[PDB]
Design a protein around this motif. Sequence first.
Motif, mmCIF file in Angstrom:
data_model
loop_
_atom_site.group_PDB
_atom_site.id
_atom_site.type_symbol
_atom_site.label_atom_id
_atom_site.label_comp_id
_atom_site.label_asym_id
_atom_site.label_seq_id
_atom_site.Cartn_x
_atom_site.Cartn_y
_atom_site.Cartn_z
ATOM 1 N N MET A 179 0.801 -1.213 0.000
ATOM 2 C CA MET A 179 0.000 0.000 0.000
ATOM 3 C C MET A 179 0.835 1.265 0.000
ATOM 4 S SD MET A 179 -2.940 -1.512 -0.137
ATOM 5 C CE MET A 179 -2.999 0.010 -1.029
ATOM 6 N N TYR A 182 2.369 2.590 -5.005
ATOM 7 C CA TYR A 182 1.302 1.868 -5.694
ATOM 8 C C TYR A 182 1.285 0.367 -5.469
ATOM 9 C CZ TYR A 182 -1.142 0.190 -10.013
ATOM 10 O OH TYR A 182 -1.971 -0.436 -10.916
ATOM 11 N N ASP A 183 0.079 -0.141 -5.717
ATOM 12 C CA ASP A 183 -0.774 -0.495 -4.589
ATOM 13 C C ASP A 183 -1.533 -1.805 -4.627
ATOM 14 O OD1 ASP A 183 -0.405 1.868 -2.955
ATOM 15 O OD2 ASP A 183 -1.594 3.063 -4.380
ATOM 16 N N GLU A 185 -3.195 -3.638 -6.714
ATOM 17 C CA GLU A 185 -3.135 -4.636 -7.773
ATOM 18 C C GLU A 185 -1.902 -5.533 -7.696
ATOM 19 O OE1 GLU A 185 -0.991 -4.898 -10.695
ATOM 20 O OE2 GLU A 185 0.430 -3.388 -9.936
ATOM 21 N N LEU A 228 -9.396 -0.941 0.076
ATOM 22 C CA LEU A 228 -9.417 0.470 -0.293
ATOM 23 C C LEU A 228 -10.818 1.008 -0.582
ATOM 24 C CD1 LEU A 228 -6.376 1.033 -2.700
ATOM 25 C CD2 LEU A 228 -6.635 1.898 -0.357
ATOM 26 N N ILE A 229 -11.588 0.309 -1.427
ATOM 27 C CA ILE A 229 -12.856 0.848 -1.917
ATOM 28 C C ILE A 229 -14.059 0.448 -1.069
ATOM 29 C CG2 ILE A 229 -12.012 0.909 -4.288
ATOM 30 C CD1 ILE A 229 -13.360 -1.666 -4.888
ATOM 31 N N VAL A 241 -11.323 6.099 2.617
ATOM 32 C CA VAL A 241 -10.453 5.158 1.924
ATOM 33 C C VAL A 241 -9.329 4.712 2.837
ATOM 34 C CG1 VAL A 241 -8.765 4.998 0.075
ATOM 35 C CG2 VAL A 241 -11.014 5.991 -0.374
ATOM 36 N N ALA A 391 -8.470 10.629 3.506
ATOM 37 C CA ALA A 391 -7.801 10.638 2.209
ATOM 38 C C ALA A 391 -7.913 11.970 1.490
ATOM 39 C CB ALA A 391 -8.379 9.537 1.318
ATOM 40 N N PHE A 392 -9.059 12.636 1.580
ATOM 41 C CA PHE A 392 -9.283 13.910 0.901
ATOM 42 C C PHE A 392 -9.572 15.042 1.887
ATOM 43 C CE2 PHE A 392 -10.513 10.315 -1.785
ATOM 44 C CZ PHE A 392 -9.536 10.447 -2.758
ATOM 45 N N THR B 176 -14.281 13.114 -5.799
ATOM 46 C CA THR B 176 -14.757 11.724 -5.951
ATOM 47 C C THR B 176 -13.648 10.815 -5.411
ATOM 48 O OG1 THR B 176 -15.656 10.023 -7.475
ATOM 49 C CG2 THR B 176 -13.891 11.433 -8.330
ATOM 50 N N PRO B 177 -13.949 9.880 -4.496
ATOM 51 C CA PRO B 177 -15.256 9.621 -3.870
ATOM 52 C C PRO B 177 -15.713 10.743 -2.952
ATOM 53 C CG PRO B 177 -13.758 7.718 -3.598
ATOM 54 C CD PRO B 177 -12.929 8.881 -4.128
ATOM 55 N N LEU B 225 -8.654 5.328 -8.169
ATOM 56 C CA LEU B 225 -7.965 5.078 -6.916
ATOM 57 C C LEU B 225 -6.809 4.094 -7.055
ATOM 58 C CD1 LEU B 225 -10.575 4.663 -4.059
ATOM 59 C CD2 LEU B 225 -8.987 6.599 -4.411
ATOM 60 N N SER B 227 -5.249 2.872 -9.814
ATOM 61 C CA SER B 227 -4.406 2.863 -10.995
ATOM 62 C C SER B 227 -4.331 4.267 -11.571
ATOM 63 C CB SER B 227 -4.922 1.859 -12.037
ATOM 64 O OG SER B 227 -6.158 2.260 -12.642
ATOM 65 N N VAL B 238 -2.205 6.316 -4.076
ATOM 66 C CA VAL B 238 -3.651 6.348 -4.205
ATOM 67 C C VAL B 238 -4.157 7.766 -4.385
ATOM 68 C CG1 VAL B 238 -5.771 5.844 -2.979
ATOM 69 C CG2 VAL B 238 -3.892 4.212 -2.941
ATOM 70 N N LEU B 239 -3.629 8.726 -3.618
ATOM 71 C CA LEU B 239 -4.193 10.071 -3.647
ATOM 72 C C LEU B 239 -3.949 10.792 -4.959
ATOM 73 C CD1 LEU B 239 -3.497 11.283 -0.030
ATOM 74 C CD2 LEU B 239 -5.380 9.896 -0.962
ATOM 75 N N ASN B 241 -4.497 9.081 -7.834
ATOM 76 C CA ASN B 241 -5.321 8.319 -8.772
ATOM 77 C C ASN B 241 -6.802 8.749 -8.777
ATOM 78 O OD1 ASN B 241 -2.952 6.951 -9.396
ATOM 79 N ND2 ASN B 241 -3.445 5.173 -8.100
ATOM 80 N N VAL B 242 -7.078 10.034 -8.539
ATOM 81 C CA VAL B 242 -8.380 10.653 -8.760
ATOM 82 C C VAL B 242 -8.103 12.001 -9.411
ATOM 83 C CG1 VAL B 242 -9.462 9.503 -6.840
ATOM 84 C CG2 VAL B 242 -8.416 11.763 -6.512
#
Lengths: 542, 542
Positions: A179, A182-183, A185, A228-229, A241, A391-392, B176-177, B225, B227, B238-239, B241-242
């Motif tokens: 994590m 990148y992450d 996948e 994550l989601i 997240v 996260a945001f 988003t999200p 998120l 990718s 991750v941050l 990937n939006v």
Amino acid sequence: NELDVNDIYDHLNEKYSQFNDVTFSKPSTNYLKPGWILDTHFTFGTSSEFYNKSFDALSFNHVDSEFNMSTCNDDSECGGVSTCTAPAYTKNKDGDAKKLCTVPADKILDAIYDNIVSAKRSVDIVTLQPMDISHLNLSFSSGAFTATIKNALSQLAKNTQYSDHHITVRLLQGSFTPMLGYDAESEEEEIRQLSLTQTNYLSEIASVLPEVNNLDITVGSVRSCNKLISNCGNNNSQKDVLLNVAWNHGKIINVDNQSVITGGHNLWGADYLQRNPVNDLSINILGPIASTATKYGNTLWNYVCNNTTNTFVTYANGQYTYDCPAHISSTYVAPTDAKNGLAVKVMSISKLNNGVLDKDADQSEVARVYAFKNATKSIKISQQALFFKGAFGKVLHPLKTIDGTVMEALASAIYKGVTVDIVTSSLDGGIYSSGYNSEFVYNYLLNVLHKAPYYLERNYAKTFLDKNLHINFISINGRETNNMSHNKLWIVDDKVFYVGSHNIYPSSLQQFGVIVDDKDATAQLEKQLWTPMWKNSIHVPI
Amino acid sequence: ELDVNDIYDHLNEKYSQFNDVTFSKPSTNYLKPGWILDTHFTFGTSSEFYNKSFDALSFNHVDSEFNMSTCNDDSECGGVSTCTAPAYTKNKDGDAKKLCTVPADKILDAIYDNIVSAKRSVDIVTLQPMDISHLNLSFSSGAFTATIKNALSQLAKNTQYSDHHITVRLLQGSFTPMLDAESEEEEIRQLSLTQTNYLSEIASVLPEVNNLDITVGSVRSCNKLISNCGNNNSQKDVLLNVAWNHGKIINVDNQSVITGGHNLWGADYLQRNPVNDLSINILGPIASTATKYGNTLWNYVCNNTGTITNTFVTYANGQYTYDCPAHISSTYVAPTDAKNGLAVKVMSISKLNNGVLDKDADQSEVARVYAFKNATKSIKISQQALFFKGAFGKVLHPLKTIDGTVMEALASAIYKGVTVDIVTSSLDGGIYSSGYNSEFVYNYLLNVLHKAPYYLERNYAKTFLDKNLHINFISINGRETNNMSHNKLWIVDDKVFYVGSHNIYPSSLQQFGVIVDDKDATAQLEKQLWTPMWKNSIHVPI
Ligand code: NA
Ligand code: NA
Ligand code: NA
Ligand code: NA
Ligand code: NA
Ligand code: NA
Ligand code: NA
Ligand code: NA
Ligand code: NA
Ligand code: NA
Ligand code: NA
Ligand code: NA
Ligand code: NA
Ligand code: NA
Ligand code: NA
Ligand code: NA
Ligand code: NA
Ligand code: NA
Ligand code: NA
Ligand code: NA
Ligand code: NA
């Protein structure tokens, strides 16, 4: 009457009886010997310039690469608060110790070495994986902790070389590591890197043990959620997240299901035992509480063994195998002279949801909300942070419980006239920052008092806060503004206190901790750590 | 000295396929008195004194629409305010209000004046208001909302006999999200609801029949998120990937443009404790480039093509429709007396990758890196932050381009003897924090000088930093340590400067800005903003 841990246990048993002996335990009598407070930090009341001189070496000496302390012929060659000392934990496989300029914080190494080399049956280590810090994937330990562990195992092998039976050594880390960068996948490659690091760690240990020995050593990593989601397995109202990953955060060193070291310390030497130390606390305790720690370990290791996304390997009888040590017996057997020391009542509390056990299995938060809601005189809190940035940018608060949140309990305490004293890490603490200033916490509590059953007009509520709430942040000496704390500590009514891994700020990580209920022990803890820290902490007026 | 022509020529050599998409050939444009829309507390005063500007006496009140005190004469206004009856308070029935106004309200004057003069089009691009407890708001908050409504009312009256309708586009980038990634359908529903309410509020203050065709819409180009969104970054997490729009534009009649760092958030700029920020008001063919930027986004919104879905709605001729305004003509027609004011060379510079256009379409980063690499005398920088904290604590630095990073460019300028003055938001600036202290930046640049082609020994690199690098953070008076800045500003050689949305700290959001090349204009900007801000900033040594 003041808070009794028995009431905490009764409440948990009524509301969560299916998790009795899983995430909490009936209070038991355990024993604290001299030296049980493993509080490590700079020397309160001095200065970082002075303390950091403790790691200066004179020209004709050098800084030892294994322990990151100066070499040493007598006390006159050591600066700062350090003295010349030849600890047993420097003793390598050939029996030779080193003279080093040691500091009080090294007490934690003394406790780990001394506990491990005494093992007759089992050594059980649960921790968090070291952070990146460029230097490739380290595992389980860094700095002086690594050498300490290695030296301890070497001595352990000698102490048990004629044993009837083998000693089970388990090392387990919670892993963050797909994590970080990148992450979600890339899990296959990450397993590969972890496997390599763990194999090298085990090989390094094996190379300091006799060719034939009675140690069965397993190393492993655990993560329970990488989604994550979506939710990891909890009853949170908040959604974010950053809450949707999970790994172990509990910190345990459990020998022979008898002697437990637990607290906030990761096994990261540069963060605690060198210049500019982070402040942190663990304890060294003996007795049936070890059973509960053992159970915690078993829960994680079972999970690792019957879902090996995770990885592990063991070295025993000269061979690597996948023999998985899922279970150490949790049945308590009192060692001889176990009753030496101060007798105290102790219960365990854990958080084992978010993908390990059922989503309801967070009894640690409930117990602390109950403790704060039922304090009758005072609440003392020392944390790194109380809130956590999502996260945001959303402020995430301590998590919701059937009995509400920590913030709601503290608002109730303040309304009732209970003193609430809080020590936070500094805002300018880098990696160990408080995230949010004192004013933020004050205003959050103000807003809680505006709503809810209280409905207080703002200015009137400020009188409760100004009388009863006092928020400071840690400082070595009341002047420096960038010092760091990793404490996960609280004390209610100068009687009941928590030591473990569980931050008040929210996460989905698994946690283990203990609640001690005893006035003498609390008084020792306050004399040794709380009072000095408080006297040197800084208050930002509102 | 640096010439904007050289920036354009470099972009055109390396990225000719994006000419007139993400950059433009420099053109002559015009700056009239008042073009500098810098809003901030009054430098040199105190927050106590400045904030008194919003106190109302017992017999007056704080207007709910504009969040300023009511007013009979200057003697009823405190702080730095005066009693004023601005046009932008004039409601649909023509009645202005007397309010205690402050210098920062200049931005409202600029918006209103520009909108009510429109004969063809009103094109607004911005970022969606943050959800701090309140509703989902859209497009604007606080005084800005009331200004826009009032402006549109007046615009309807001014155009009531028009031969043709006026196109009014409002576009916001949407997080988003929203405050988990899993529920996109519900996300769109909530966005639609807010946009509908905003549009209906506007409709309710226009004549029943009028010549305004008003569209409101939201745009987000990536929600993955897990990718890459569409870039050539070396960094990952991750941050990044939006992605959604971050550019900030108010463009009237493809002629008059307000652009810079300001969102239309009233409480953040125009009330107590103002955040510092800068926009400009400029007239001329540069507006064409802004129109193109809007078209690019609106085309994307109208012709989705699939994957992520965005949402919009139009109100015209008494009816809600899905008539999508994908294109306002970008052909520049000079208004009469357009050459009034200071004539300056200006080019546009945009970032439209990460899901809207091809992944190579980030020419804004390249432009600034070139500008820093080719400074000959000085670089002045005013930002909120230069680094950004990633999902799990990783430090994210300004992004890689084909010419390196911003930090590599600044290291080069420092090594060559170029003065680099940086103003950052405060560390203790809450929502608008710098994220990292000044020492962190110093040490990051030290490390850059240790690697790369320089390979400088640490202490020798410190000589360059100590001579040429000065990092301060914003303060109203050189004492207060929690003031806030949202600037996205830089100035090279007291000659070339950027105004727009693109932070130096990294993100994947789309950006729009302009680069002005003129000594007189840069001197006006330094006298009005840079010099007072610099004189009142704070330096933390070491
Ligand atoms: Na410390
Ligand atoms: Na035995
Ligand atoms: Na273990
Ligand atoms: Na919650
Ligand atoms: Na886990
Ligand atoms: Na320490
Ligand atoms: Na040490
Ligand atoms: Na401590
Ligand atoms: Na705690
Ligand atoms: Na945690
Ligand atoms: Na716990
Ligand atoms: Na006012
Ligand atoms: Na628009
Ligand atoms: Na990059
Ligand atoms: Na604008
Ligand atoms: Na402002
Ligand atoms: Na105002
Ligand atoms: Na400004
Ligand atoms: Na740029
Ligand atoms: Na960029
Ligand atoms: Na700034």
